[PDB]
């Protein structure tokens, strides 16, 4: 079911998951690992 007008709270859960999964310097660590 869709999420109308609840999206302020839901818009930031995905951002928090993104910054938990990936740090802020991920483009450096991934490049050096590769």
């Amino acid at each position: 079911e869709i999420t109308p007008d609840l999206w302020q709270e839901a818009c930031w859960i995905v951002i928090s998951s993104y910054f938990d999964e990936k740090g802020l310097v991920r483009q450096q660590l991934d490049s050096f690992d590769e």
Binding site: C11, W12, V14, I15, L24
Partner: protein, 49 residues
């Protein structure tokens, strides 16, 4: 109300994710003249802490 696009393919997660690291600590950067935002981005790297 009268369709502008009606054919969207993607959606911004949050429009404020266009800012960087120093520019995203500014409160209400959309109420500031942009050079002031740039100057804070430059000065936020000089703040003691």
């Amino acid at each position: 109300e009268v369709a502008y696009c009606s054919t969207y393919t993607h959606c911004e997660i949050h429009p404020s994710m266009i800012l960087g690291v120093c520019a995203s600590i500014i409160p209400f950067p959309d109420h500031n003249q942009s050079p002031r935002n740039t100057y804070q981005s430059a000065m936020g790297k000089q703040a003691m802490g």
